[PDB]
Amino acid sequence: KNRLELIPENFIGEGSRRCKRQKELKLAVSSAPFNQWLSRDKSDNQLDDMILQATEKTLGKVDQDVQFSDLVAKFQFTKFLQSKSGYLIPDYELTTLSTPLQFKRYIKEKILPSANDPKLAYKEAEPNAIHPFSDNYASPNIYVVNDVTSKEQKSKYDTIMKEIQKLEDDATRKALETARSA
Amino acid sequence: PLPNAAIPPKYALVTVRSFPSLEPLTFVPVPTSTVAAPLRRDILWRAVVYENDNRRVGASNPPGRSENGFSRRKLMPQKGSGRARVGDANSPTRHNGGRALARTAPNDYTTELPSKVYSMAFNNALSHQYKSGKLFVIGGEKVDLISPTPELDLNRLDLIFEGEVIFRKFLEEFQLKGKRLLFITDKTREGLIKSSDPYKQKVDVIQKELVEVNDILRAQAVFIELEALEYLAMAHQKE
Amino acid sequence: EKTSFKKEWKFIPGDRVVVMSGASKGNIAVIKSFDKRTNSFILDENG
RNA sequence: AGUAUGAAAAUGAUUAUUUUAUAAGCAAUCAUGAAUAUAUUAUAUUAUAUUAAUGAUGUACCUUUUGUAUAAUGGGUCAGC
RNA sequence: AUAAUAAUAAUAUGGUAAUAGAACAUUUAAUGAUAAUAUAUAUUAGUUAUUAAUUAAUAUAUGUAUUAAUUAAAUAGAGAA
Ligand SMILES: [Mg+2]
Ligand SMILES: [Mg+2]
Ligand SMILES: [Mg+2]
Ligand SMILES: [Mg+2]
Ligand SMILES: [Mg+2]
Ligand SMILES: [Mg+2]
Prior knowledge:
This is part of a larger assembly, with chains A, B and C.
Chain A: H1 17-30, H2 44-58, H3 71-85, H4 91-96, H5 100-116, H6 150-181
Helix pairs in contact in A: 2-3, 2-5
Chain B: E1 11-17, E2 26-31, H1 32-35, H2 41-55, H3 115-132, E3 135-138, H4 163-174, E4 181-185, H5 190-196, E5 203-207, H6 213-218, E6 221-225, H7 226-235
Parallel strand pairs in B: 1-3, 3-6, 4-5, 4-6
Antiparallel strand pairs in B: 1-2
Helix pairs in contact in B: 2-3, 4-5
Chain C: E1 16-19, E2 27-35, E3 40-43
Antiparallel strand pairs in C: 1-2, 2-3
Bound molecules: magnesium ion (MG) (6 copies).
Chain B binds two RNA strands through residues 45, 48-49, 52-53, 56, 60, 62, 84-85, 92-95, 97, 99-103, 109, 214, 217-218.
């Protein structure tokens, strides 16, 4: 003789087939057999030693500024570099660059900046994108207003409000309890 | 003499991989003409447009004053009415009538392109893709491998059904969830297609012989068999 | 007449039922009768 | 001749601002007082907007013509085609 | 030895029939971020040598562009029957 409320504890059935499937898929994704030869991503200090390590692995004690001996060796070097780094290099780049030092330089130029600053990264949808800061304009009068998405800000605000609610409400509850006690 | 008269580089290295993950096995040297051609966008444009034209259905069929339903009766006498002159009620001048210069049944929008030009365009597309670094070649049986092909993963470009899960995992790994991709395959890898069909909207799976320039250009990342690639090269050679 | 079903219903007048997604969502009610044309049920005093 | 929606116009009534009962003609443009309205920099000796004081200038538009204000052709207005 | 912009000097810039060159609006297809602090349409006042677009305020939608741009095309622009 009451309204039960629709909480999943009261439900008993083998339905929600489209949700169950999704859940299963998620589970599978979480634990699946896969090579994954690039787990952690490469800081510039790391890069500095990484190249050396690669050289040691491959060709032994040879100058980094000097060219590769053979193609197989080069391939070996490059693969190793990729694996240690986390970021795979475009085949064109591989074809072009003919020395470990050169490779390192390329890496520094290209993949390092996006690793440190995440919003400075390359989104394909806008290839002609530009990312200016107030520092770039060498003058006090010029400044760049921060691009914080009007969604993110909103979310933050909401979170703050929630936190406040949790706090003040909790305090009130505590007070009430105290009153009840004495 | 003519100074600065160098000889051009004739080859370019494309790293062969293994398609569930993508672990580099070998370098293969492919000719410069099919993978490092300078970007001639106008040639590309010629191809793409041509392709589009050929793809048209062309079913614009409004009724002309001939095909429109009315009778041929002259609605009003020539004179005596004090009104404007009228013929049959099919004139495009009147709201219910036919359309002037109507387009009729199957409209043919097909155009021609020299085969050589088309081939060049194809090559150019491939080159562009390679330059982008969004060309990925998969293969093994045909060439000597430097690193040995790993276990639990093959070189066939093939895979609830488990395959789908694997595909999903691969996508997750390679940061190419939302973006469109193109699998150029040597034969009908049915399993692969089955795996991919959940992500059908963003996934093209194409048989070798039927790959289009548009399809390559459209695709944000292309995955091709080594054999298929070779075949393509042979097709759009030069001679 | 073709679209209406005839059992082929998921419920029968008499049995007890929970109603959700309405103004009285989470309600409990006895289903008193059905309207065939509309393929719908009428619920005791509630719903 | 589907269902929603509808500050689209032509068209009607009404109210407000303004001009108008010694003034004559494509009803506009330019000059130029005055009155009203709005304006979170009207600081004002302010700025915009509206409005047929008053002055000057000003033969509708198309078509066809050697040539049209023509009293030559065509159009009641608006919307859609 | 180019392009874009800005100078200096010069010459040229009425136009029917007609020829030539360059743009914009609308709609569809290919590619395509983004977001209710956004967008679309409308009204009013601004702005840019201005058939266009943009800014601000206002009103109505809509969990949101076939959106910017480049192509391809057109049932692609109406006071004149
Ligand atoms: Mg005259
Ligand atoms: Mg008349
Ligand atoms: Mg002229
Ligand atoms: Mg038309
Ligand atoms: Mg009209
Ligand atoms: Mg006009």
